[PDB]
Amino acid sequence: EAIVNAQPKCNPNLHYWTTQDEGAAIGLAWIPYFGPAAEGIYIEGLMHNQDGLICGLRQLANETTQALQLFLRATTELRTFSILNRKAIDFLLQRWGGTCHILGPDCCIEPHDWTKNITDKIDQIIHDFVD
Amino acid sequence: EAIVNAQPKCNPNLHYWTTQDEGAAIGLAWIPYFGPAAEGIYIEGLMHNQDGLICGLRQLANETTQALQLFLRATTELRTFSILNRKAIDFLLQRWGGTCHILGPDCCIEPHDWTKNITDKIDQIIHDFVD
Amino acid sequence: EAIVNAQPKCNPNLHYWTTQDEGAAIGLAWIPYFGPAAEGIYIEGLMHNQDGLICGLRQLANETTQALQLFLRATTELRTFSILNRKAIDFLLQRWGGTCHILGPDCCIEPHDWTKNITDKIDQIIHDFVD
Amino acid sequence: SIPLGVIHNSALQVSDVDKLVCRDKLSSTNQLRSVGLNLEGNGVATDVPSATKRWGFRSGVPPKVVNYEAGEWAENCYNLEIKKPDGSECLPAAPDGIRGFPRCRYVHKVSGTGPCAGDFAFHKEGAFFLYDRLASTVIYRGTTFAEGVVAFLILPQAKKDFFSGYYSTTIRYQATGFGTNETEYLFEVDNLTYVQLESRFTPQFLLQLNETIYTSGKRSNTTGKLIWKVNPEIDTTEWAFWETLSFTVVXXXXXXX
Amino acid sequence: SIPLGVIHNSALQVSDVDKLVCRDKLSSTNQLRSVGLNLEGNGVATDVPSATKRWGFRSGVPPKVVNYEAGEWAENCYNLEIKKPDGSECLPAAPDGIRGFPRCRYVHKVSGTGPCAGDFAFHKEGAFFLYDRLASTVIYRGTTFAEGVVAFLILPQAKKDFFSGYYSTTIRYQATGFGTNETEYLFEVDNLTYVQLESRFTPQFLLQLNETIYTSGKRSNTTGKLIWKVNPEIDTTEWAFWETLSFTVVXXXXXXX
Amino acid sequence: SIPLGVIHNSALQVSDVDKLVCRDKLSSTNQLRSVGLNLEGNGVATDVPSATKRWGFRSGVPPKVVNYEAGEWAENCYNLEIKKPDGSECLPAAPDGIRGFPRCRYVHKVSGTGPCAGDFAFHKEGAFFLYDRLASTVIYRGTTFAEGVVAFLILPQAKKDFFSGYYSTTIRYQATGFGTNETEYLFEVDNLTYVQLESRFTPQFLLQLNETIYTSGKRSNTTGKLIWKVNPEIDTTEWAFWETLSFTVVXXXXXXX
Ligand SMILES: *[C@@H]1O[C@H](CO)[C@@H](O[C@@H]2O[C@H](CO)[C@@H](O[C@@H]3O[C@H](CO)[C@@H](O)[C@H](O)[C@@H]3O)[C@H](O)[C@H]2NC(C)=O)[C@H](O)[C@H]1NC(C)=O
Ligand SMILES: *[C@@H]1O[C@H](CO)[C@@H](O[C@@H]2O[C@H](CO)[C@@H](O[C@@H]3O[C@H](CO)[C@@H](O)[C@H](O)[C@@H]3O)[C@H](O)[C@H]2NC(C)=O)[C@H](O)[C@H]1NC(C)=O
Ligand SMILES: *[C@@H]1O[C@H](CO)[C@@H](O[C@@H]2O[C@H](CO)[C@@H](O[C@@H]3O[C@H](CO)[C@@H](O)[C@H](O)[C@@H]3O)[C@H](O)[C@H]2NC(C)=O)[C@H](O)[C@H]1NC(C)=O
Ligand SMILES: CC(C)Cc1ccc([C@H](C)C(=O)O)cc1
Ligand SMILES: CC(C)Cc1ccc([C@H](C)C(=O)O)cc1
Ligand SMILES: CC(C)Cc1ccc([C@H](C)C(=O)O)cc1
Ligand SMILES: *[C@@H]1O[C@H](CO)[C@@H](O)[C@H](O)[C@H]1NC(C)=O
Ligand SMILES: *[C@@H]1O[C@H](CO)[C@@H](O)[C@H](O)[C@H]1NC(C)=O
Ligand SMILES: *[C@@H]1O[C@H](CO)[C@@H](O)[C@H](O)[C@H]1NC(C)=O
Ligand SMILES: *[C@@H]1O[C@H](CO)[C@@H](O)[C@H](O)[C@H]1NC(C)=O
Ligand SMILES: *[C@@H]1O[C@H](CO)[C@@H](O)[C@H](O)[C@H]1NC(C)=O
Ligand SMILES: *[C@@H]1O[C@H](CO)[C@@H](O)[C@H](O)[C@H]1NC(C)=O
Ligand SMILES: *[C@@H]1O[C@H](CO)[C@@H](O)[C@H](O)[C@H]1NC(C)=O
Ligand SMILES: *[C@@H]1O[C@H](CO)[C@@H](O)[C@H](O)[C@H]1NC(C)=O
Numbered sequence A, B, C: 001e002a003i004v005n006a007q008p009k010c011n012p013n014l015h016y017w018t019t020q021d022e023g024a025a026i027g028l029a030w031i032p033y034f035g036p037a038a039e040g041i042y043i044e045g046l047m048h049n050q051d052g053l054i055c056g057l058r059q060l061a062n063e064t065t066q067a068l069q070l071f072l073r074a075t076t077e078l079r080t081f082s083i084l085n086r087k088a089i090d091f092l093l094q095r096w097g098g099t100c101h102i103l104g105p106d107c108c109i110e111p112h113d114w115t116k117n118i119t120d121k122i123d124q125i126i127h128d129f130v131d
Numbered sequence D, E, F: 001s002i003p004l005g006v007i008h009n010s011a012l013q014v015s016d017v018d019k020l021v022c023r024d025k026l027s028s029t030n031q032l033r034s035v036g037l038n039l040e041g042n043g044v045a046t047d048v049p050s051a052t053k054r055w056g057f058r059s060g061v062p063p064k065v066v067n068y069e070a071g072e073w074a075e076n077c078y079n080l081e082i083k084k085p086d087g088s089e090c091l092p093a094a095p096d097g098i099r100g101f102p103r104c105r106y107v108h109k110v111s112g113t114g115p116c117a118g119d120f121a122f123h124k125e126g127a128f129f130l131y132d133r134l135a136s137t138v139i140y141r142g143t144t145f146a147e148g149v150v151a152f153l154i155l156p157q158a159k160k161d162f163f164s165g166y167y168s169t170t171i172r173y174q175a176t177g178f179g180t181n182e183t184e185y186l187f188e189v190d191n192l193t194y195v196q197l198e199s200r201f202t203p204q205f206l207l208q209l210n211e212t213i214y215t216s217g218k219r220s221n222t223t224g225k226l227i228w229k230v231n232p233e234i235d236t237t238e239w240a241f242w243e244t245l246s247f248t249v250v251x252x253x254x255x256x257x
């Protein structure tokens, strides 16, 4: 599909917060005893609406809600942390879950260099055919 | 192995219940505030013993218990949700965890179309050998 | 990198404990009601410093701590069980996450047997070229 | 390793992810399923006396929970409220998010007492207690469960073979000496009227007997406890569920002949 | 299926792992992201009266929590301390490890009472309550939250397009008849001085009005409660946040004209 | 990124899943391992005075737990029962399913008091407290632990190189001024008989001293407290564990020369 923003408004800027997974290399700050409290682990950034990505993102999050809620209704986990890892697995299973038929539409193996390796080396059997 | 049902009896029918992962598209029913309570999220079905699959399934569940219990003894997770995802990963690692040696017994890459692509195109070098 | 043990000392022996994932086949011991209590599920072993692996392991665990702590700061999971499964996924995504360009440095597909299958079978077209 | 079912040659087979061949296709996690199957369906005795003899108390073993995504409609489930003689609870409260088994035709609610020599109650045969999409190794207080076991499958991508609403009825029991060799059970008609329970009494016989007691006026019409006994000569129904009178007086014991 | 955003042809698109082509590259779990977006940014009314009308109590639905890795700085968040008339708590305590939303310019702390006809408070429009990297389907007691929704993305490997510190201010409110048709709200200046709240009052107007009351000496100088009203003729600011006087007396009601 | 050990050229090496070459084979999740290693094995001082100086109280940091699948048998573990002067608990109770470290030759059980200026006790050097296959960033009340760190490995598929039962002894200590510059420690012989602790006292020296006190009859034979001191001239054992008298009187202080 495509993303059709259909909200009353769009804040075109995303002033965001997040954590850094490897962000306190300075001295002893990585040690929990010395490091920041819960309130001071965030990094900030600002992102503008190049390629309409912010207004798209807002619409995408809105449209994700129905599916997400229905998934949460169906799970017995109290806190769900596995959605992105499960997407990662399903990515791999789509591509690599069966036999990969080379040159078929559902197999991501490029022989491009292996084509011209053999077209190059027929000219040491038909080219080198010396009587 | 094969599944040898060795129980005193077998109910050949499986009158089952389950949740649907995307099952309440009608209006506002997906919204938790409006949707069904815990008791009304289930779908039902009936499955008969074609190919002996129900009687097999009963035996399979029985035989799974020892391994499952021993796995639960060994885990420190209080609630285990990761068994099927871990099977998915191990499926992928079996096939794709090493180098895939083409035409070997442990590599699921079919060159069938790539064989006859090159047998087709030798006849624009040995067939087209015009003096 | 390489592992440079830089600790004051190294116990060269690793007298270890662990659980066995499928370890109580004897009779009824797999059944929780009959099996061992929490205290009696461990197996032991002893491992010496062949190839400097124990002294390396000690240093590796020391050096892992900063990254691990920073990862734990950033997660909202109270108990983290998914580190090795996530490594497994990232292993697969590194190798198989894109298109596999055959004979490129980032594609683990060996055509070795498929090379000499076709070099063997040109000698039923150039070898068998009977007038 | 944990076995994994798969459909090959029009038959279910045990294998695992290691034992598959390239022809076998796992193109999505949707193909993976965990199913709970009820001991009922293997032909076990489902009457309260026979069923409770399969459970027992034990200390030192930490409880464990595994989830399962689909289950089987049960005829018989159980719901236990057991205390020690001193009035302290024998079973733990249901953990957060552990609700009772979702489809039970008859819930056998047993209230009573026993020694309860152990921290948690386990299945002596190694089976699980099935709750709402969570299988526990132990019994939770006042929470409905079916005894059962769990299977894991790789379903095929498309089609897997060659070719009534939900009513639940609660049945109450009093118990003494629970989880011992000398356990005694009473089927409850009202708070003062009871029947001495036996293994041969089916759920439908109990509901019919109850129906008869209310409509024959054979309930305790005093402040005191009335315990009926059915003498051996009255049959009630050795067939599985899916293939299937006068009263005189002698607490207050009595006979129904 | 849960939608998954991806950047194709200089545009965000919905697809999923099943709908991709081989050119699309997922070489690491780092490329996967969950983002929380605030309803604010879609243009919803953020005033306490309008905001609370989107929430409601309901029983029988178990709460659910999903995590998200990054969020948006909010103008408006909310923190609820609601009790029944009998003094019992309407909302559950925050579960272990659920802290409040980390960036709020204004936290609207509403204390008060209401019937609270239901076990948990949900979002009537299906949105989530965003806490510190955890989104819940329900409201926790005394824990700051932003209303919002969650998106999942596959970011590209490198670069994704063509080509002030943190201050939080708490604003206190009294409420009666919370989560009903006849809810009443009072903005709190001190423990004895209040203003009748209206939907048109913005956060900056409330802080300015508060500032004026303290520096004009219009606070209750008795033991009793003083409730100011602002008559209709005084405007306060229909534009979104990112694009943007005398006192006389008549408990004790009063008018600011 | 979190480092991942791997065996290349008959040596352990740091790399990660991103840095591997196609020759490296991960054919199963069984090849992945997390191991806990004890600070003991790096040569740290294991005596109670030296060990406790590595821990400290701190607020605002949420505790975190990670699991590990295999550990090392410890000589020295610790079990803390600390209270404030007002009798309130300094450490939280063990969360559900966090049992103590499974192999300790000596468990140093320290009971006592201190200011405890912070919500949780952390490791000042950044190490973890190792419990039964769970590593925490904090110390739990009355739960045995070894100080340590965690490694992750990809083991090879087959063979990884070129080419006594379990006894635990508990040792009790009294403490005052715990987690401060002026902490005082007493080794406990019985409820009335104590020894002033010093860093140079090894576990085997304490058990030998205890053995001597009981078999020389040097225990308090009154209602009152008796605190022995060992004067500087009596040595006890700077070597690691894996490579290795008269009494007179002066509460009631005393000297063992
Ligand atoms: C899987 O299915 C099998 C077959 O139905 C079940 O086997 C049962 O195993 C128990 C032992 O755990 C047997 O009970 C024992 O019976 C003997 C007398 O025969 C008695 O002396 C012992 O004290 C004990 O009670 C039981 O007879 C046996 N059933 C059959 C039909 O042979 C097994 O329990 C199932 N596994 C699970 C996890 O449900
Ligand atoms: C995703 O975005 C859409 C569009 O902004 C949101 O749609 C909103 O949906 C609700 C219904 O759930 C609408 O409320 C209803 O309004 C009618 C009158 O128009 C009233 O009779 C109903 O009782 C109800 O209040 C709301 O008008 C509508 N918004 C717009 C601008 O059309 C939707 O809520 C968003 N989804 C999430 C999960 O946030
Ligand atoms: C990993 O191994 C290294 C080396 O054994 C450990 O390094 C230790 O780091 C701490 C700082 O966190 C050092 O303590 C400091 O000592 C100085 C005086 O030298 C003092 O002024 C400071 O106040 C502080 O106490 C310690 O000396 C150092 N050890 C060595 C032998 O150099 C490190 O702790 C290990 N990491 C983990 C997580 O266990
Ligand atoms: C062997 C196989 C036929 C068992 C089986 C059992 C239940 C279900 C339901 C429809 C589900 O999707 O959970 C499918 C397949
Ligand atoms: C569509 C895309 C541009 C959204 C988006 C939002 C937040 C972030 C931050 C930097 C993160 O890494 O979480 C990246 C990308
Ligand atoms: C580097 C390597 C030799 C470390 C190591 C440590 C412990 C174990 C045990 C047998 C386990 O399987 O957990 C294996 C390997
Ligand atoms: C259990 O009770 C039975 C009678 O029901 C009796 O024969 C037996 O002695 C008892 N067993 C034990 C171990 O006490
Ligand atoms: C029976 O007793 C229980 C408590 O033991 C009580 O809750 C119930 O109302 C009583 N029912 C009748 C019909 O007396
Ligand atoms: C017993 O009979 C009465 C009267 O018909 C009925 O109300 C009651 O529910 C019956 N008991 C059971 C267990 O169904
Ligand atoms: C009173 O008691 C007896 C049972 O004890 C019962 O059979 C009798 O019918 C009751 N009386 C009436 C009028 O029903
Ligand atoms: C809710 O209150 C309004 C007035 O604010 C009133 O008109 C209406 O009758 C009430 N609705 C219900 C359902 O009681
Ligand atoms: C206002 O009242 C609250 C309790 O309702 C109290 O905690 C606070 O200190 C009071 N503040 C002032 C300024 O009186
Ligand atoms: C109201 O004004 C006083 C005095 O300037 C100030 O202390 C107080 O914080 C203000 N209230 C708010 C909500 O900012
Ligand atoms: C006392 O009360 C009134 C408000 O009720 C206020 O306007 C007046 O200024 C106060 N007095 C002083 C000296 O500020």
Ligand SMILES: *[C@@H]1O[C@H](CO)[C@@H](O)[C@H](O)[C@H]1NC(C)=O
Pocket (backbone or CB within 6 Å): F181, F182
């Ligand atoms: C800590 O105690 C020492 C003596 O043991 C003393 O010299 C020092 O002043 C104290 N430090 C602080 C910061 O109070």
Ligand SMILES: *[C@@H]1O[C@H](CO)[C@@H](O)[C@H](O)[C@H]1NC(C)=O
Pocket (backbone or CB within 6 Å): F190, F191
């Ligand atoms: C020592 O005191 C503790 C309580 O402080 C008590 O539990 C224990 O029994 C006592 N032991 C002896 C030998 O007196």
Ligand SMILES: *[C@@H]1O[C@H](CO)[C@@H](O)[C@H](O)[C@H]1NC(C)=O
Pocket (backbone or CB within 6 Å): F169, F170, F171, F172, F207, F210, F211, F214
């Ligand atoms: C001290 O000695 C006595 C007598 O031999 C013994 O019972 C006690 O356990 C000893 N203490 C320790 C800590 O081993």
Ligand SMILES: *[C@@H]1O[C@H](CO)[C@@H](O)[C@H](O)[C@H]1NC(C)=O
Pocket (backbone or CB within 6 Å): F216, F217, F218, F219, F220, F221, F249
């Ligand atoms: C009584 O007390 C002292 C220690 O205070 C001890 O040395 C002495 O031997 C004790 N008496 C006996 C008979 O052991």
